[PDB]
Every structure is written in C-alpha cells, then in structure tokens.
Design a protein around this ligand. Structure first.
Ligand SMILES: O=C1C[C@]2(CCN(S(=O)(=O)NC3CCN(CCNC(=O)c4cccc(-c5cn6cc(C(=O)NC7CCC7)ccc6n5)c4)CC3)C2)C(=O)N1
Ligand SMILES: [Zn+2]
Length: 319
C-alpha cells in the first residue's frame, strides 16, 4: 500500500541492455490504406495501440528481417490470432520499433528491440515466403473518438477502487489503455479491438469490468489465484505489461499484491529480473502444478512493497 520504487523503471526494460539505439521518426499509415507489412513469426499475442512489446530474436531469419526493417520504417505486424495453432487471424495491430541493439556473444547474433503498438488493421492476405518470413497485406483501420467523458470518469472511478491518476486524458488513448490493462481473456480482447469508435470501446469496457470477479488457474478451472482488488501498478504501462525472458519468450504479466494457492519453486533470484531491485521466484499452482507466474520479493528493507506477484494471462482465466 506504500511504494518505494521508480515506477518508470520497469518500462525501460533494463534487463535487455544498458543503452539501445533510440529512434524518433514516426510512421503513421493513412486511414483505410492497404499496406504490405512483415509478420514476426514467434510473436503470439494480442497487441494494443500504445502497448509496449519487448523482443529478443536469435533465429538468423528474424535477425535479418529486423536488421532490414531498422533501415526502413521499423514497423512489423502483430496478428491477433483467432486460433493460435491454425495461424488464423483476421485483425491485428502494427508495432513500431523505437529501440534496438545488436549483440553478438553466445556464438549467435542477437537483436533486442522494444516496439510499441501504433495502429490496428484488418488482414487481407497472409502469404509466407520461401524462406519463412510471413508477409501481411493489411488495411489500416480508422480511429474514432466521441463525446462521452462520463464513461471515462466512470472507468476511472472503478479503476481507483482496485488500486490508487496519471492516466491518459485522450478518449482514444484511454480507450486502449483500458483494453491492454484489464484482466480480460483473449476473446474479449479481440472484441475491444474490432470496435471502431472509442465510445463503443469505453462503453463496452465499462460493461466487462463490472462482470469481472477473480482470476483462476487455467488448467484447474476452480482455483482462485487472485481477486480483482489486489491489482497493483508497479509500472508506468500499468498493472499489465509484457516482458521477455532470456530465451526470448514474451510474457504478459499482471502485478498483484496477494495471491493464493501458489507454490514457490526454489530460492529467489535476481538474474534478468524485470523489476530492478527485486528478486523472482517461480510460482506454481498448488493442485495442478502448472506455472502461473513469479513471486517478486524486495532485496532491501528500504523499498516498498516488500512482496508482490506477477502472473501471466496465459495461465489464468476470469471466473
Ligand atoms: O523477473 C523475471 C521473471 C523471469 C525469471 C526467469 N523466468 S523464465 O520465464 O525464464 N522461467 C520460467 C520458469 C520455467 N517455466 C515453468 C516451469 N517449467 C516448465 O513448465 C517447462 C516445461 C517444459 C520444458 C521446460 C524447459 C526449460 N528449459 C530450459 C532450457 C535452458 O536452456 N536452460 C538453461 C538456460 C538456463 C539454464 C532449455 C530447455 C528447457 N525446457 C520447462 C516457465 C518459465 C522469467 C525473467 O526472465 N525475469
Ligand atoms: Zn491449477
């Protein structure tokens, strides 16, 4: 309930690298325009405009694609797969690289990037080259706003009950902040993205956060892991942010203060820690033993909070 922590520290993704080449030029595709944007193969998430996405690529094809993209408009396509295994996606969001680093070592050539969601699109064609790089023929969607600040002042009211402003004031920007930080599942995330007007998004987004109770283990159905009132915001991105592990896997985690039915595996560690100053420990379900997230404990008595949890969306479902 008290915070001694640079909340703007997790957004920097210091674990990735000390200093990376920043990029300031901004590409924004005109409304209803048809573009050919390449797709990163391993990324399997629902990206929201403004959501930051970190990446660590080791395959020579991914390195060759992003090395090429850096010299151009630095924009790749993140599809919102309707079925993950079937590669079936009809919508998606563009991602613009704003940070980049070329590290060798480990015998391989690596590229670490930090992208951010820009604009949604409707997929027209999804064609794969002979090498393997997937290219997407997409149609940029238009961004409608509207006059309904009462809806924003109602979202902000229930948001502050679960955690104690500094939120976006733009009705459009705030509509996507809510879409990226609410503990909703993928199917609901797509419904928010398919919505065109911010008024519909904000009016809809009000409808779910009243029907959202608690989060339970996916493999277990009825194992209450945390409630909608334990949400803690330790980052400027909010209570929901994406972080990449040493292997390159992106985890969309949620920061909560109290969690139940969780077993910690081993002793705390500070290696590659996503929250500088804290140590991590693998948290597992008590019954089914499926990985739920990580327990973060402070390494100093001067900082606060002393403990919190970061659980991934892929292991939890609302109930
Ligand atoms: O603050 C933060 C938070 C964290 C801290 C670190 N994480 S974590 O995501 O890395 N680890 C978590 C914990 C492990 N997983 C749950 C349990 N295991 C499983 O279910 C499971 C099932 C089947 C296969 C495997 C598996 C593990 N293997 C490791 C290697 C490898 O090369 N090992 C060497 C290099 C290190 C020695 C190779 C093959 C491989 N197969 C595992 C979930 C991921 C995030 C961070 O990075 N920063
Ligand atoms: Zn379980």
């Amino acid at each position: 309930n008290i915070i001694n922590f640079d909340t703007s520290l997790p957004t920097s993704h210091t674990y990735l690298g000390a200093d990376m080449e920043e990029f300031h030029g901004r590409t924004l595709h005109d409304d209803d325009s048809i573009q050919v944007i390449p797709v990163l193969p391993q990324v399997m998430m629902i990206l929201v405009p403004g959501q930051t996405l970190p990446l660590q690529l080791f395959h020579p094809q991914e390195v060759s694609m992003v090395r090429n993209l850096i010299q151009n408009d630095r924009t790749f396509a993140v599809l919102a797969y309707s079925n993950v295994q079937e590669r079936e996606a009809e919508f998606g969001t563009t991602a613009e690289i704003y940070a980049y680093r070329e590290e060798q070592d480990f015998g391989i050539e690596i590229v670490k990037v930090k992208a951010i969601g820009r604009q949604r699109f409707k997929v027209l064609e999804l064609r794969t080259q002979s090498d393997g790089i997937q290219q997407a023929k997409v149609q940029i969607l238009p961004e409608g706003s509207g006059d309904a600040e009462t809806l924003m002042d109602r979202i902000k009211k229930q948001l502050r009950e679960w955690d104690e402003d500094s939120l976006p004031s733009n009705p459009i920007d705030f509509s996507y902040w809510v879409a990226a930080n609410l503990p909703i599942d993928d199917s609901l995330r797509i419904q928010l993205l398919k919505i065109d007007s911010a008024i519909q998004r904000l009016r809809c987004e009000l409808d779910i956060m009243n029907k959202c109770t608690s989060l339970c283990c996916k493999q277990c159905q009825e194992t209450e892991i945390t409630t909608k009132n334990e949400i803690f915001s330790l980052s400027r991105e909010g209570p929901m942010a994406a972080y990449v592990n040493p292997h390159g896997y992106v985890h969309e985690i949620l920061t909560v203060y109290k969690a139940c039915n969780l077993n910690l595996i081993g002793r705390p560690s500070t290696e590659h820690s996503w929250f500088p100053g804290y140590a991590w420990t693998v948290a597992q379900c008590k019954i089914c033993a499926s990985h739920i997230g990580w327990k973060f404990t402070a390494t100093k008595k001067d900082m606060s909070p002393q403990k919190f949890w970061g659980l991934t969306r892929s292991a939890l479902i609302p109930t």
